[PDB]
Amino acid sequence: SCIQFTRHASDVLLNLNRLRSRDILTDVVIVVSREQFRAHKTVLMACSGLFYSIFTDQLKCNLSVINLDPEINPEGFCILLDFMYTSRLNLREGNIMAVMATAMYLQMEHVVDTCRKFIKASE
Amino acid sequence: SCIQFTRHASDVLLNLNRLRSRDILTDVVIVVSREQFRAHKTVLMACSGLFYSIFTDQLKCNLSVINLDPEINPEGFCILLDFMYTSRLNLREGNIMAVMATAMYLQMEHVVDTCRKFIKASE
Amino acid sequence: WVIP
Amino acid sequence: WVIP
Numbered sequence A, B: 001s002c003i004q005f006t007r008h009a010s011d012v013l014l015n016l017n018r019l020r021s022r023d024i025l026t027d028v029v030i031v032v033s034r035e036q037f038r039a040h041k042t043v044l045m046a047c048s049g050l051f052y053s054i055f056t057d058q059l060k061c062n063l064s065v066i067n068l069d070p071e072i073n074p075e076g077f078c079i080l081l082d083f084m085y086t087s088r089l090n091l092r093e094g095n096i097m098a099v100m101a102t103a104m105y106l107q108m109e110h111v112v113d114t115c116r117k118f119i120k121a122s123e
Numbered sequence C, D: 001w002v003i004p
């Protein structure tokens, strides 16, 4: 018999992105080649099958630094990290291949889906 | 020129509630009289003006235990904590006064609003 | 607020 | 997915 506040989940995510921008309570740095991205492990796990697996691991759960595969593109990761915290995906002709490859590695199925559909439309 | 995934914020919140249920990466215990509630500081701050103030404080940000005012009702807190993690508010005739008082203390304006409207309708 |  |  609960009532539900429609905008609550979006409002929570907006405040989680504000915390990220101010570097408040971030507990991990994701290293992608020469670039570093600070984030909250809980948000990363909530968005990505890869991070969910990593941070449920009894040893990796305590690491402050995670190094991604050297094939991962930093811009592609940046775009996906922004998506995690905002629901908005900056998908462009010039970045779609990197975004899709990064989303496959991060196991972000909905992003992979749409990248596949946008690529199919251009061929 | 971003695209947006409509269900993303709800999906994130669902996974944050799964983390809470499994006690994964919880970093604080909220003590309400004889009861204890484990949570994630980032979610508490994202939902509550009181916790936002507490956890941005340069000393309180590092506490693992927060004790609420002894006038706070544990069930009212439980209902609001569930709301934080689900967008669903279990508002009942028998708990509305406790929920509204707890929401005022926690500075959860939308919950206070609706409690006020539900009370006004019954008088 | 809505009835979900 | 939508145009926000």
Ligand SMILES: N#Cc1cnn2c(Nc3ccc4c(c3)CC(=O)N4)cc(Cl)nc12
Pocket: A045, A046, A047, A048, A049, A050, A052, A107, A108, A109, A110, B015, B016, B018, B019, B020, B022, B024
């Ligand atoms: N507890 C917990 C918890 C935290 N996070 N999380 C999940 N995170 C996840 C796992 C796989 C995938 C995605 C997110 C997006 C995607 O495409 N695949 C799942 C579950 Cl079942 N549980 C949890």
Ligand SMILES: N#Cc1cnn2c(Nc3ccc4c(c3)CC(=O)N4)cc(Cl)nc12
Pocket: A015, A016, A018, A019, A020, A022, A024, B045, B046, B047, B048, B049, B050, B052, B107, B108, B109, B110
């Ligand atoms: N950074 C950050 C950040 C984390 N959380 N958070 C806010 N959390 C908040 C503050 C006040 C109120 C509510 C939530 C619900 C309500 O009724 N009042 C606000 C801002 Cl402006 N910023 C942040």
Ligand SMILES: [Cl-]
Pocket: A047, A108, A109, A110, A111, A112
């Ligand atoms: Cl996704």
Ligand SMILES: [Cl-]
Pocket: B047, B108, B109, B110, B111, B112
């Ligand atoms: Cl609220």
